[PDB]
């Protein structure tokens, strides 16, 4: 058995880089050691920038209808939500959608595209080589190798691939211990919106809620399995009361552990996800990072596979992505420190509190956590380059239609603004990899593209080449060449 | 002897307490420990809210002399600098003056207005009663007592006048405890501008260049009352670097931790504190002497009011309520540097989010303005959104030509600036006349200014504006702020 991508895991990160991976007609095949989906969310919600990309594949409707909808973001508990109406976005805010809801979407999107999944069966070593790479994977019915031209390791923050390459992990050691429980209770929680502040012990306890009558509770203590147990004893000892609670769902441990992997590929071996980056789970970052890595890196490994992308395409994906974990590392670990109860923190809790008031800083940390900020280092000098393309209203013949619609393929497009047709002549040898969206204009005159003429766009939704009238067609090729391959 | 107020300490706060006390008729007593005034320098600049407050008492010319301009500001030592030309000043930089310098302005200043000031006298003990306060002097040639309205204890940190009567410095304990020494070494420096540093120790060695071949030296341990002795910097030193890098030419020994206290309250009868008295902190950014002098300006011609029996009785009493909040943002910001400058690994993604909100225009503005005193706003009940803001040392067109608008600052009297041929404000003000000063423009030489949709303001003695008039408005609410802030009319 050959395929092109073997992934080992089907967690958010898997499912959404075997979507994209098929979307770019890659043979994909995706081993998962549990043999039936876990029943627990870690994740509860996604951010603006994960429901944007599942807008531009079709997927968004999906998850919307999970209603909740929270406009305000959390910065280490400080009282002063990230607002993310600030935002050039059709979705100005986060959506609370249960991790076990996330990977039964994503689940159903890579079987209806093909993707081949195989639960219950594990990777546990692999052999590379120039021409491609062995996994060896144990199964239901037993032990067996597959071959293919990539593996990618989405298995997690203990990633099995990770420590079979060799590839190094830095980072730091936790300062901070917790334990989680989602479960219902007997007796009324104490306000705080629930829990109890202990400076004097090191420690406390929050909890909220996740549906009528259950609450995902946390106990935090400051410089095996968890059991029903541990959590009454912790509960008792900070709280100072039981408060009867019964029927857990889940329970789990906590750390401020923070580290990245020193290279997100080795060969033809990639890391994605948990895999190359574990964090405080501070902000809900994990689930949206690793499933914008998954973005990222499936439509520059897909064409990588088709043998059309240029050779150094690949090499992006560790180049552009890297930055971006550590940006979330930075933030959960500044929030790790705000979030301890020693006094020693309070002057420093209290200026940022006066800090999240003025306006652009608290933009610019919910640009960060939103991901509605990222921002990869692209050849030019107009603003909009390396940042995404907003959810534009397009007029056209036939009305008004979303620039997200254009996206579903996952080809690149080139976005034209107006009669002049000198760039579809000049884009016509990359006709196969991209689209061109000829729009008469923008239905909104306020837009961020107004100046322009003309955009190219990755698949993933960022751009990589504008044109004003003064500039015209330059680059273009250029751009064209660097993230699409040579002409026809 | 009586005295209107005693003052007890010649640092800067002491100093320009009494120059602001002279301005406001005050007879003036500034009693010092030392003999002879210090050899060294622990603040090595002013910044600029400081620098606008001398322009308009007619002394900013002396300090500038001394010409060094930084136009950048620190933040826990993070290598973006707090940028002030952002800020509607003439001073858009804090000035490197040394202390030694500034305490011989400010003493040339206090002397020139005929404070008395007897150094190697100290204050051992104080009396209060509802008539005045007796105070207890050891002096050069023995013991004796002085009597006067009111005391203010200018002491510095260890405030003997704070302990006296008894206020509580609540606070918090040190994490972290360094030694400094203004030093020459033979040896060449590592680059660290010049330090080691030490995770395995958590602790630091620093050093920056004061003057051409002379440094300011500081080895930090993070989580010893006794005088710093030469020895002590050298093990320290030692400790962490392992050598003392050829220090010889010791200008300045001393101990310094990031203790972080307020007094309780600011005033206990007729007895208050000022400076270093009512507020330690972690020297972080440079901030204590520009506090310390700004309580003194803010304090000075409320306290002279209360003597000279014109002020309301409610008057100095909006002291500790005003200085309070701005001592308590500058125990804030350095107890969150003490912090960000502790070489624990763990501070590392702080650190790196703070250097990244330090390029955030808006955050470098607000920390800048915080640290610079640019937008230090006091509490008024009035709506309009100058109230308690420092007015702009504006270029006023008049008859006789442009003048600045600090010009009109000398005599430490309030000012109240008209912008236009309308006068009905002069007769309405007329009554305070011998408080304020009417000064009578055509306009603002200058577009931009924060005056611009005004044509009438009316200033505190510290620069300070308590009530304005736009067009539409007109008059109301001049009496009441004039009652409120220069009493009663004669
Ligand atoms: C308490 C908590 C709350 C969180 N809240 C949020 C939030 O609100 N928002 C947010 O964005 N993120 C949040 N996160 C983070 C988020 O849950 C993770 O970042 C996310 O699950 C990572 O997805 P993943 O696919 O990379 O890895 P995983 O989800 O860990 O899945 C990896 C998969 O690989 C499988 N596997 C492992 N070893 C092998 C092997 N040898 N062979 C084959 N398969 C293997 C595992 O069975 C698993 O299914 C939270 C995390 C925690 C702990
Ligand atoms: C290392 C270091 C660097 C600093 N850098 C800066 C900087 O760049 N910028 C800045 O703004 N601030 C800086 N500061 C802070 C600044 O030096 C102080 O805040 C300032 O000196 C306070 O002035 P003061 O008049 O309140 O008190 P002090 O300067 O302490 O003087 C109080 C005076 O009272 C006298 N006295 C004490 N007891 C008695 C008594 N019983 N009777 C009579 N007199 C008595 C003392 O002799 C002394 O002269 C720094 C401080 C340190 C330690």
Redesign the pocket.
Known sequence: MRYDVVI?????????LACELRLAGARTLV????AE??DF???????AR?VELLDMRGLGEGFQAEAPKLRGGNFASLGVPLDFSSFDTRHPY?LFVP?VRT?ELLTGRALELGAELRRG????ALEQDADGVTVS?TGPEGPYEVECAYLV?????????RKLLGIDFPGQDPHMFAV?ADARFREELPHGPYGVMRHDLRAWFAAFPLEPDVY?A?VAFFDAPVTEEDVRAALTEVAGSDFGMHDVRWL?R?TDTSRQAERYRDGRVLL????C??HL?A?????????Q??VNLGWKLGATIAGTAPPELLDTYEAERRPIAAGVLRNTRAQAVLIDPDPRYEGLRELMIELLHVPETNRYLAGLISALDVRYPMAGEHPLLGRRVPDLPLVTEDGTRQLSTYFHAARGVLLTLGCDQPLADEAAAWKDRVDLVAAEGVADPGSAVDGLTALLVRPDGYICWTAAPETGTDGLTDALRTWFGPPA
Do not use: W
């Open positions: 080992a895991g089907a967690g958010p990160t898997g499912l959404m081993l998962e050691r549990l989906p876990v969310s870690k994740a509860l919600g996604v951010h994960t986060a991790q990977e069966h594990a990777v546990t994977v390791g989405c298995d997690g923050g203990g990633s099995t691939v989680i995902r946390t789990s906590l994605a996800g948990d895999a980056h574990i789970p902000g809900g970052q994990g689930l949206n990072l690793g499933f890595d998954a």
